C-alpha cells in the first residue's frame, strides 16, 4: 500500500564505532538497511526536524585510534543520502539532544578530558549553531526530554560522580533550574516524554547496569517507579512511537544487547518485540 513512520537507529558500538543506519517498522516487524554514515560513531544522539533525521556529536572509537565528533550530519529519507552541516562549537561524545520548535539543543557530552556543561542551539533554516545558558552541572551520558516546550536534562556523569540530579532549561528566559532528583543514580540512561511525563529507563548507577524505570510528573514534582524492563541495559537508544516507548540495545556489563523492549503505559507492561541485526551500545534513535 504505502509505508508509515519508522524508528531509525544510527551508528553505535560493537568491537568498534559503527556506520549502520537501520530502521524498524513497528507495524510489520521488519528492519531496513539504509545508507551508512560518512564516518562511523558511537554515543551520538538522534533527532528529527521537518522530515529530516540528524546525527549529532558522539566519537569514532576505531581500531586505529579515536576522535570525539563536533559533527552534525543530516539524513534525508527521500534520497537515502547523508549531507554534512555546520559542526558544533566543540566535540560532544555522549551528548544529549532535544528539539524545541524546529531547533536542536545539544547539551553536555565530553571532548576527551573536558566534561561539558555548555549547551548549543542549531537553526536548520540558517545552518548555524549558537551557545546558550550553560547547565548548572557538567553532564555526559545525559538523558534529555522536551516537555511543555521546556528541555529537561536528567542524570549523567560530571567527570567525578554519576548524578541522580536533573535540571530544566527555559528557552524563553534562557535559564536553568534544578528539579527533584530521581530515586536512582543513572549515567547513560534512556530518557523521553510520553503522555506528559519524563521517563528514565536503565543506565549505570556506578556499580551495576539497571532495568528499573521511573517517571517524573511535572505537576506533583515526584519520581514514581513503574514496571522494570526485562533486561538490564546502560547506553541504550530510546524513542516514543505510537504512544509506546521502545528501548534499543545497550550494554549490561557482560554483552552488547540486540534486544528491543516496548512499554504500554495503558497496561504498565513491557514486552520484547524484536532484535537488531547486531548488538550495539550508544546508538542514536529517532522516528519519522
Amino acid at each position: 500500500p504505502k509505508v508509515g513512520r519508522l524508528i531509525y537507529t544510527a551508528g553505535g558500538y560493537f568491537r568498534q564505532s559503527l556506520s549502520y543506519l537501520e530502521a524498524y517498522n513497528p507495524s510489520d516487524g521488519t528492519w531496513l538497511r539504509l545508507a551508512d554514515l560518512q564516518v562511523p560513531r558511537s554515543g551520538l544522539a538522534g533527532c528529527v526536524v521537518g522530515g529530516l533525521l540528524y546525527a549529532v556529536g558522539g566519537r569514532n572509537n576505531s581500531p586505529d585510534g579515536n576522535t570525539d565528533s563536533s559533527a552534525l550530519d543530516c539524513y534525508n529519507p527521500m534520497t537515502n543520502q547523508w549531507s554534512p552541516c555546520a559542526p558544533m562549537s566543540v566535540p560532544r561524545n555522549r551528548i544529549g539532544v532535544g528539539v524545541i520548535d524546529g531547533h536542536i539543543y545539544a547539551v553536555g557530552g565530553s571532548h576527551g578530558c573536558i566534561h561539558h556543561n555548555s549547551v548549543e542551539r542549531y537553526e536548520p533554516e540558517r545552518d548555524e549553531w549558537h551557545l546558550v545558558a550553560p547547565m548548572l552541572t557538567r553532564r555526559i551520558g545525559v538523558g534529555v526530554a522536551v516537555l511543555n516546550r521546556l528541555l529537561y536534562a536528567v542524570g549523567g556523569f560530571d567527570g567525578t560522580n554519576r548524578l541522580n540530579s536533573a535540571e530544566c532549561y527555559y528557552p524563553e528566559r534562557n535559564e536553568w533550574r534544578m528539579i527533584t532528583a530521581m530515586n536512582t543514580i543513572r549515567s547513560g540512561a534512556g530518557v523521553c516524554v510520553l503522555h506528559n511525563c519524563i521517563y528514565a529507563a536503565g543506565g549505570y548507577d556506578g556499580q551495576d547496569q539497571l532495568n528499573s524505570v521511573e517517571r517524573y510528573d511535572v505537576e506533583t514534582e515526584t519520581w514514581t517507579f513503574v514496571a522494570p524492563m526485562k533486561h538490564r541495559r546502560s547506553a541504550l537508544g530510546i524513542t516514543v512511537h505510537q504512544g509506546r516507548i521502545y528501548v534499543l540495545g545497550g550494554y549490561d556489563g557482560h554483552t552488547f544487547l540486540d534486544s528491543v523492549e516496548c512499554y504500554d503505559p495503558d497496561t504498565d507492561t513491557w514486552s520484547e518485540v524484536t532484535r537488531m541485526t547486531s548488538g550495539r551500545s550508544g546508538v542514536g534513535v529517532a522516528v519519522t
Binding site: 558511537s42 572509537n61 579515536n66 547513560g188 546502560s234 547506553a235 552488547f256 551500545s281
Partner: peptide
C-alpha cells in the same frame, strides 16, 4: 581499558 557504562574499550 574498558568503560563499564558504554562497554567501549579505550587504550
Amino acid at each position: 581499558v574498558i568503560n563499564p557504562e558504554t562497554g567501549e574499550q579505550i587504550q
